Amino acid sequence: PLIVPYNLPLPGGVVPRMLITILGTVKPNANRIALDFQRGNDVAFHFNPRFNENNRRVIVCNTKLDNNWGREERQSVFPFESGKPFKIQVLVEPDHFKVAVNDAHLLQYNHRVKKLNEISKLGISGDIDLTSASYTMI
Ligand SMILES: OC[C@H]1O[C@@H](O[C@H]2[C@H](O)[C@@H](O)[C@H](O)O[C@@H]2CO)[C@H](O)[C@@H](O)[C@H]1O
């Protein structure tokens, strides 16, 4: 497998029709998963499934600019399960990141960081075994 935290370069950054596919297994007793699309120190798109936030499972999305978190966008649909293999697909669209999990549309995140060509790293972290992380152009 791959080592977590894992950082995947996005050469020349992200562009519409770029599809990123993450395969992994959620650890038993997992607490968190995080995908961080980075523009230098800023986090353009933080995708953060939380398995126990006040005894609820929730996905938090946010952007971090100059070390400051913005308005969180929370999704209560939680297709992840401890112990079980997942597929995360992030499709870059002109106005948002489109996320599907195990082939089901999960959420959309309107681009707050506008310089898409400067979002050049994807950090992958959390309580998972990482099987594969790749991108393609569709
Ligand atoms: O917004 C993503 C960001 O959240 C941080 O935790 C927040 C928490 O979600 C919020 O409910 C609370 O009031 O403030 C905390 C600190 O901002 C996480 O620490 C961070 O990892 C990100 O996931």
Side-chain angles (χ1 to χ4, degrees), residues 90-137:
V90 176
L91 177 57
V92 181
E93 306 249 43
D95 287 342
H96 40 77
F97 298 93
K98 196 174 67 193
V99 184
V101 174
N102 304 339
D103 292 313
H105 177 260
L106 173 61
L107 63 80
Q108 292 174 13
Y109 189 81
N110 191 273
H111 295 306
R112 314 191 179 163
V113 168
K114 309 302 187 172
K115 292 167 169 149
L116 291 186
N117 58 338
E118 295 190 357
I119 303 175
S120 294
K121 288 188 217 59
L122 170 61
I124 304 167
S125 63
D127 307 311
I128 61 154
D129 299 325
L130 186 47
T131 296
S132 166
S134 55
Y135 47 78
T136 190
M137 301 289 319

Short mmCIF file of all heavy atoms in Angstrom, two decimals, residues 90-137:
data_model
loop_
_atom_site.label_atom_id
_atom_site.label_comp_id
_atom_site.label_asym_id
_atom_site.label_seq_id
_atom_site.Cartn_x
_atom_site.Cartn_y
_atom_site.Cartn_z
N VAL A 90 -12.90 12.59 -7.05
CA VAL A 90 -13.08 14.02 -7.04
C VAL A 90 -12.93 14.46 -8.49
O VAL A 90 -11.85 14.33 -9.08
CB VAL A 90 -12.06 14.75 -6.15
CG1 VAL A 90 -12.25 16.27 -6.29
CG2 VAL A 90 -12.19 14.32 -4.72
N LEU A 91 -14.02 14.94 -9.07
CA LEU A 91 -14.00 15.45 -10.43
C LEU A 91 -13.98 16.97 -10.39
O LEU A 91 -14.87 17.60 -9.81
CB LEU A 91 -15.21 14.95 -11.23
CG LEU A 91 -15.31 15.50 -12.66
CD1 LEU A 91 -14.05 15.18 -13.44
CD2 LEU A 91 -16.52 14.94 -13.36
N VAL A 92 -12.96 17.55 -10.99
CA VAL A 92 -12.86 19.00 -11.05
C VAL A 92 -13.75 19.52 -12.17
O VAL A 92 -13.58 19.17 -13.35
CB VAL A 92 -11.43 19.46 -11.27
CG1 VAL A 92 -11.37 20.99 -11.31
CG2 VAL A 92 -10.51 18.90 -10.17
N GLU A 93 -14.74 20.32 -11.80
CA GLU A 93 -15.64 20.93 -12.76
C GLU A 93 -15.33 22.41 -12.81
O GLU A 93 -14.63 22.92 -11.94
CB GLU A 93 -17.10 20.68 -12.39
CG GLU A 93 -17.44 19.23 -12.19
CD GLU A 93 -18.35 18.70 -13.26
OE1 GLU A 93 -18.11 19.02 -14.44
OE2 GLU A 93 -19.29 17.96 -12.92
N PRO A 94 -15.85 23.13 -13.83
CA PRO A 94 -15.50 24.55 -13.90
C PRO A 94 -15.83 25.36 -12.64
O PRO A 94 -15.04 26.23 -12.29
CB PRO A 94 -16.31 25.04 -15.11
CG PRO A 94 -16.38 23.83 -15.99
CD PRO A 94 -16.56 22.68 -15.03
N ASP A 95 -16.93 25.08 -11.96
CA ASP A 95 -17.30 25.91 -10.82
C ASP A 95 -17.18 25.21 -9.48
O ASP A 95 -17.32 25.85 -8.45
CB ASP A 95 -18.73 26.44 -10.96
CG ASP A 95 -18.86 27.51 -12.01
OD1 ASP A 95 -17.82 28.10 -12.40
OD2 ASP A 95 -20.01 27.77 -12.42
N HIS A 96 -16.92 23.91 -9.49
CA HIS A 96 -16.79 23.19 -8.22
C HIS A 96 -16.01 21.89 -8.31
O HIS A 96 -15.77 21.35 -9.40
CB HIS A 96 -18.18 22.90 -7.65
CG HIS A 96 -19.18 22.49 -8.68
ND1 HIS A 96 -19.21 21.23 -9.23
CD2 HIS A 96 -20.15 23.20 -9.30
CE1 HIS A 96 -20.16 21.17 -10.15
NE2 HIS A 96 -20.76 22.35 -10.19
N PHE A 97 -15.58 21.40 -7.15
CA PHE A 97 -15.15 20.01 -7.04
C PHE A 97 -16.38 19.14 -6.85
O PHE A 97 -17.22 19.42 -6.00
CB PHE A 97 -14.22 19.81 -5.85
CG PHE A 97 -12.94 20.58 -5.94
CD1 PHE A 97 -12.85 21.83 -5.36
CD2 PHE A 97 -11.82 20.04 -6.56
CE1 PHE A 97 -11.67 22.53 -5.41
CE2 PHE A 97 -10.64 20.74 -6.61
CZ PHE A 97 -10.56 21.99 -6.04
N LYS A 98 -16.47 18.08 -7.64
CA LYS A 98 -17.57 17.13 -7.51
C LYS A 98 -17.03 15.85 -6.90
O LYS A 98 -16.11 15.23 -7.44
CB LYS A 98 -18.23 16.86 -8.87
CG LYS A 98 -19.59 16.21 -8.76
CD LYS A 98 -20.25 16.11 -10.13
CE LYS A 98 -19.49 15.14 -11.04
NZ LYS A 98 -19.92 15.26 -12.48
N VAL A 99 -17.57 15.46 -5.76
CA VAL A 99 -17.10 14.27 -5.06
C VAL A 99 -18.13 13.15 -5.12
O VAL A 99 -19.31 13.34 -4.83
CB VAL A 99 -16.76 14.58 -3.60
CG1 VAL A 99 -16.18 13.35 -2.93
CG2 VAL A 99 -15.79 15.77 -3.52
N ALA A 100 -17.67 11.99 -5.55
CA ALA A 100 -18.48 10.78 -5.51
C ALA A 100 -17.74 9.75 -4.68
O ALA A 100 -16.51 9.67 -4.73
CB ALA A 100 -18.75 10.25 -6.91
N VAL A 101 -18.49 8.98 -3.91
CA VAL A 101 -17.91 7.95 -3.07
C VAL A 101 -18.60 6.63 -3.41
O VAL A 101 -19.83 6.54 -3.42
CB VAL A 101 -18.04 8.26 -1.56
CG1 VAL A 101 -17.56 7.08 -0.73
CG2 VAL A 101 -17.23 9.52 -1.22
N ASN A 102 -17.80 5.63 -3.73
CA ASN A 102 -18.32 4.33 -4.09
C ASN A 102 -19.38 4.48 -5.17
O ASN A 102 -20.43 3.84 -5.12
CB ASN A 102 -18.85 3.60 -2.86
CG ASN A 102 -17.79 3.46 -1.77
OD1 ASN A 102 -16.59 3.55 -2.04
ND2 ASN A 102 -18.23 3.24 -0.54
N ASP A 103 -19.09 5.39 -6.10
CA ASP A 103 -19.83 5.60 -7.33
C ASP A 103 -21.15 6.30 -7.13
O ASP A 103 -21.97 6.33 -8.02
CB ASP A 103 -20.04 4.26 -8.03
CG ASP A 103 -18.75 3.70 -8.55
OD1 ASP A 103 -18.00 4.47 -9.17
OD2 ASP A 103 -18.47 2.50 -8.32
N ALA A 104 -21.32 6.91 -5.96
CA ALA A 104 -22.53 7.68 -5.69
C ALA A 104 -22.13 9.11 -5.46
O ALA A 104 -21.22 9.38 -4.67
CB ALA A 104 -23.27 7.13 -4.49
N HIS A 105 -22.81 10.03 -6.13
CA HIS A 105 -22.53 11.44 -5.91
C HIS A 105 -22.70 11.77 -4.44
O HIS A 105 -23.68 11.38 -3.82
CB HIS A 105 -23.44 12.33 -6.76
CG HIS A 105 -23.22 13.79 -6.50
ND1 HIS A 105 -24.05 14.53 -5.69
CD2 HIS A 105 -22.22 14.62 -6.88
CE1 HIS A 105 -23.59 15.77 -5.61
NE2 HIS A 105 -22.48 15.84 -6.32
N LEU A 106 -21.72 12.46 -3.87
CA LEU A 106 -21.74 12.82 -2.45
C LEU A 106 -21.99 14.32 -2.26
O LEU A 106 -22.97 14.72 -1.64
CB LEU A 106 -20.43 12.43 -1.76
CG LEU A 106 -20.35 12.94 -0.31
CD1 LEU A 106 -21.49 12.33 0.52
CD2 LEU A 106 -19.01 12.67 0.34
N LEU A 107 -21.09 15.14 -2.77
CA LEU A 107 -21.24 16.58 -2.60
C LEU A 107 -20.50 17.36 -3.68
O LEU A 107 -19.73 16.79 -4.45
CB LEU A 107 -20.77 17.00 -1.20
CG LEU A 107 -19.31 16.80 -0.77
CD1 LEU A 107 -18.41 17.92 -1.33
CD2 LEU A 107 -19.18 16.75 0.75
N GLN A 108 -20.76 18.67 -3.72
CA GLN A 108 -20.08 19.61 -4.60
C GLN A 108 -19.53 20.72 -3.73
O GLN A 108 -20.17 21.11 -2.75
CB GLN A 108 -21.02 20.19 -5.67
CG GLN A 108 -21.47 19.18 -6.70
CD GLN A 108 -22.52 19.73 -7.66
OE1 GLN A 108 -22.74 20.94 -7.72
NE2 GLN A 108 -23.16 18.85 -8.42
N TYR A 109 -18.36 21.23 -4.08
CA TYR A 109 -17.74 22.30 -3.31
C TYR A 109 -17.38 23.41 -4.27
O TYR A 109 -16.46 23.25 -5.06
CB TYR A 109 -16.51 21.78 -2.56
CG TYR A 109 -15.92 22.75 -1.55
CD1 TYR A 109 -16.47 22.88 -0.29
CD2 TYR A 109 -14.78 23.49 -1.86
CE1 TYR A 109 -15.93 23.76 0.64
CE2 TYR A 109 -14.22 24.35 -0.94
CZ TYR A 109 -14.81 24.48 0.31
OH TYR A 109 -14.28 25.34 1.22
N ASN A 110 -18.14 24.50 -4.23
CA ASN A 110 -17.87 25.67 -5.06
C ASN A 110 -16.43 26.14 -4.86
O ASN A 110 -16.00 26.26 -3.72
CB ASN A 110 -18.85 26.79 -4.72
CG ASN A 110 -18.80 27.94 -5.71
OD1 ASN A 110 -17.99 28.87 -5.57
ND2 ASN A 110 -19.65 27.88 -6.73
N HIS A 111 -15.70 26.37 -5.95
CA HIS A 111 -14.32 26.86 -5.88
C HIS A 111 -14.22 28.20 -5.14
O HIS A 111 -14.77 29.18 -5.62
CB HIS A 111 -13.71 27.03 -7.27
CG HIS A 111 -13.54 25.75 -8.04
ND1 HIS A 111 -12.86 24.67 -7.54
CD2 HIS A 111 -13.95 25.40 -9.28
CE1 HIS A 111 -12.87 23.69 -8.44
NE2 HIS A 111 -13.52 24.12 -9.50
N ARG A 112 -13.53 28.24 -4.00
CA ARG A 112 -13.24 29.51 -3.32
C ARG A 112 -11.86 30.01 -3.73
O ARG A 112 -11.66 31.20 -3.95
CB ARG A 112 -13.30 29.35 -1.80
CG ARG A 112 -14.51 28.58 -1.29
CD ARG A 112 -14.64 28.69 0.23
NE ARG A 112 -15.82 27.98 0.74
CZ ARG A 112 -15.99 27.65 2.01
NH1 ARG A 112 -15.08 27.96 2.91
NH2 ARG A 112 -17.08 26.99 2.39
N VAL A 113 -10.91 29.10 -3.83
CA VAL A 113 -9.63 29.44 -4.44
C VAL A 113 -9.80 29.41 -5.95
O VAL A 113 -10.18 28.39 -6.52
CB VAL A 113 -8.50 28.46 -4.00
CG1 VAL A 113 -7.27 28.64 -4.86
CG2 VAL A 113 -8.17 28.67 -2.52
N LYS A 114 -9.54 30.54 -6.60
CA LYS A 114 -9.86 30.71 -8.02
C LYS A 114 -8.74 30.28 -8.95
O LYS A 114 -8.99 29.89 -10.10
CB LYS A 114 -10.19 32.18 -8.32
CG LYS A 114 -11.24 32.80 -7.41
CD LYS A 114 -12.51 32.02 -7.49
CE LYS A 114 -13.66 32.69 -6.73
NZ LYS A 114 -14.94 31.98 -6.98
N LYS A 115 -7.51 30.40 -8.47
CA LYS A 115 -6.37 30.03 -9.28
C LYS A 115 -6.20 28.52 -9.32
O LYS A 115 -5.37 27.95 -8.61
CB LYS A 115 -5.11 30.69 -8.74
CG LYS A 115 -5.13 32.19 -8.93
CD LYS A 115 -4.05 32.88 -8.11
CE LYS A 115 -3.90 34.35 -8.52
NZ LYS A 115 -3.46 35.16 -7.35
N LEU A 116 -7.01 27.87 -10.15
CA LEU A 116 -7.04 26.41 -10.17
C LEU A 116 -5.68 25.83 -10.53
O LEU A 116 -5.28 24.79 -9.99
CB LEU A 116 -8.09 25.90 -11.15
CG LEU A 116 -9.56 26.11 -10.83
CD1 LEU A 116 -10.38 25.38 -11.88
CD2 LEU A 116 -9.91 25.60 -9.44
N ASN A 117 -4.96 26.51 -11.41
CA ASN A 117 -3.64 26.07 -11.86
C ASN A 117 -2.55 26.16 -10.80
O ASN A 117 -1.45 25.66 -11.00
CB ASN A 117 -3.20 26.86 -13.11
CG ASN A 117 -3.15 28.37 -12.87
OD1 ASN A 117 -3.81 28.89 -11.97
ND2 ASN A 117 -2.38 29.07 -13.69
N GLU A 118 -2.89 26.70 -9.62
CA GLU A 118 -1.96 26.81 -8.50
C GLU A 118 -2.27 25.84 -7.35
O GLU A 118 -1.53 25.76 -6.38
CB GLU A 118 -1.95 28.26 -7.99
CG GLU A 118 -1.41 29.21 -9.04
CD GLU A 118 -1.17 30.60 -8.51
OE1 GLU A 118 -1.47 30.83 -7.32
OE2 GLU A 118 -0.66 31.46 -9.27
N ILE A 119 -3.35 25.08 -7.49
CA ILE A 119 -3.71 23.98 -6.57
C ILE A 119 -2.94 22.73 -6.97
O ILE A 119 -3.42 21.92 -7.78
CB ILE A 119 -5.21 23.69 -6.58
CG1 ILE A 119 -5.99 24.96 -6.23
CG2 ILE A 119 -5.54 22.57 -5.60
CD1 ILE A 119 -7.50 24.78 -6.35
N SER A 120 -1.73 22.60 -6.43
CA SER A 120 -0.74 21.71 -7.02
C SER A 120 -0.40 20.49 -6.18
O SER A 120 0.40 19.65 -6.60
CB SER A 120 0.55 22.50 -7.30
OG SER A 120 0.32 23.47 -8.29
N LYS A 121 -0.99 20.40 -5.00
CA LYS A 121 -0.80 19.22 -4.17
C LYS A 121 -2.10 18.69 -3.58
O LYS A 121 -2.99 19.46 -3.24
CB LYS A 121 0.17 19.52 -3.01
CG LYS A 121 1.62 19.69 -3.39
CD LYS A 121 2.48 19.78 -2.14
CE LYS A 121 3.62 20.76 -2.33
NZ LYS A 121 3.13 22.14 -2.67
N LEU A 122 -2.18 17.37 -3.44
CA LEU A 122 -3.29 16.76 -2.72
C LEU A 122 -2.73 15.97 -1.55
O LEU A 122 -2.06 14.97 -1.74
CB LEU A 122 -4.11 15.84 -3.63
CG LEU A 122 -5.14 14.95 -2.93
CD1 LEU A 122 -6.17 15.81 -2.20
CD2 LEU A 122 -5.81 14.05 -3.93
N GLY A 123 -2.98 16.46 -0.34
CA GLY A 123 -2.59 15.74 0.86
C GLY A 123 -3.67 14.78 1.27
O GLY A 123 -4.86 15.12 1.29
N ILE A 124 -3.27 13.55 1.58
CA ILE A 124 -4.23 12.54 1.99
C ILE A 124 -3.82 12.02 3.36
O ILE A 124 -2.70 11.55 3.53
CB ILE A 124 -4.29 11.37 0.98
CG1 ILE A 124 -4.61 11.89 -0.43
CG2 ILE A 124 -5.31 10.33 1.42
CD1 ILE A 124 -4.37 10.86 -1.54
N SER A 125 -4.71 12.12 4.33
CA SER A 125 -4.35 11.72 5.68
C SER A 125 -5.53 11.14 6.42
O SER A 125 -6.66 11.18 5.94
CB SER A 125 -3.76 12.91 6.45
OG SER A 125 -4.73 13.94 6.61
N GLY A 126 -5.26 10.59 7.60
CA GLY A 126 -6.32 10.07 8.42
C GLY A 126 -6.24 8.58 8.64
O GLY A 126 -5.25 7.93 8.32
N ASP A 127 -7.32 8.04 9.20
CA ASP A 127 -7.33 6.67 9.65
C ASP A 127 -7.73 5.73 8.54
O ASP A 127 -8.81 5.13 8.56
CB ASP A 127 -8.26 6.55 10.84
CG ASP A 127 -7.92 7.56 11.91
OD1 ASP A 127 -6.73 7.65 12.26
OD2 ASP A 127 -8.82 8.31 12.34
N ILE A 128 -6.85 5.62 7.55
CA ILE A 128 -7.10 4.77 6.40
C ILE A 128 -5.84 4.03 6.00
O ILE A 128 -4.72 4.48 6.28
CB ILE A 128 -7.61 5.58 5.19
CG1 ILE A 128 -6.57 6.60 4.77
CG2 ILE A 128 -8.94 6.23 5.50
CD1 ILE A 128 -6.64 7.00 3.30
N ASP A 129 -6.03 2.89 5.36
CA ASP A 129 -4.95 2.29 4.60
C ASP A 129 -5.20 2.79 3.20
O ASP A 129 -6.31 2.67 2.69
CB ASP A 129 -4.98 0.77 4.67
CG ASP A 129 -4.83 0.26 6.10
OD1 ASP A 129 -4.08 0.89 6.88
OD2 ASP A 129 -5.44 -0.77 6.43
N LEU A 130 -4.17 3.36 2.58
CA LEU A 130 -4.30 3.91 1.24
C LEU A 130 -3.88 2.87 0.21
O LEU A 130 -2.79 2.33 0.29
CB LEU A 130 -3.44 5.16 1.10
CG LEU A 130 -3.54 5.97 -0.20
CD1 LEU A 130 -4.98 6.21 -0.61
CD2 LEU A 130 -2.82 7.28 -0.01
N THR A 131 -4.76 2.57 -0.74
CA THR A 131 -4.46 1.55 -1.74
C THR A 131 -3.93 2.21 -3.02
O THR A 131 -2.91 1.78 -3.58
CB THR A 131 -5.69 0.70 -2.05
OG1 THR A 131 -6.07 0.00 -0.86
CG2 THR A 131 -5.41 -0.29 -3.15
N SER A 132 -4.60 3.26 -3.45
CA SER A 132 -4.19 3.93 -4.67
C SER A 132 -4.69 5.35 -4.69
O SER A 132 -5.75 5.65 -4.14
CB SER A 132 -4.72 3.16 -5.88
OG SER A 132 -4.61 3.91 -7.08
N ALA A 133 -3.92 6.24 -5.31
CA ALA A 133 -4.29 7.64 -5.47
C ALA A 133 -3.77 8.05 -6.82
O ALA A 133 -2.56 8.02 -7.03
CB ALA A 133 -3.68 8.52 -4.36
N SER A 134 -4.66 8.42 -7.72
CA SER A 134 -4.23 8.79 -9.06
C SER A 134 -5.20 9.76 -9.69
O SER A 134 -6.27 10.03 -9.15
CB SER A 134 -4.10 7.55 -9.95
OG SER A 134 -5.30 6.81 -9.97
N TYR A 135 -4.81 10.29 -10.84
CA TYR A 135 -5.69 11.17 -11.58
C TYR A 135 -5.68 10.81 -13.06
O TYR A 135 -4.77 10.16 -13.55
CB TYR A 135 -5.29 12.64 -11.40
CG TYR A 135 -3.82 12.87 -11.56
CD1 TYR A 135 -3.23 12.93 -12.82
CD2 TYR A 135 -3.01 13.06 -10.45
CE1 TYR A 135 -1.86 13.14 -12.96
CE2 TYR A 135 -1.65 13.27 -10.58
CZ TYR A 135 -1.08 13.32 -11.83
OH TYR A 135 0.28 13.55 -11.94
N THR A 136 -6.71 11.26 -13.76
CA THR A 136 -6.74 11.12 -15.18
C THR A 136 -7.57 12.28 -15.71
O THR A 136 -8.18 13.01 -14.94
CB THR A 136 -7.31 9.76 -15.61
OG1 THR A 136 -7.12 9.57 -17.01
CG2 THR A 136 -8.79 9.65 -15.29
N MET A 137 -7.55 12.46 -17.02
CA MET A 137 -8.36 13.49 -17.66
C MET A 137 -9.48 12.78 -18.38
O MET A 137 -9.23 11.87 -19.16
CB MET A 137 -7.54 14.35 -18.63
CG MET A 137 -6.36 15.08 -17.99
SD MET A 137 -6.85 16.43 -16.89
CE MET A 137 -8.19 17.18 -17.83
#
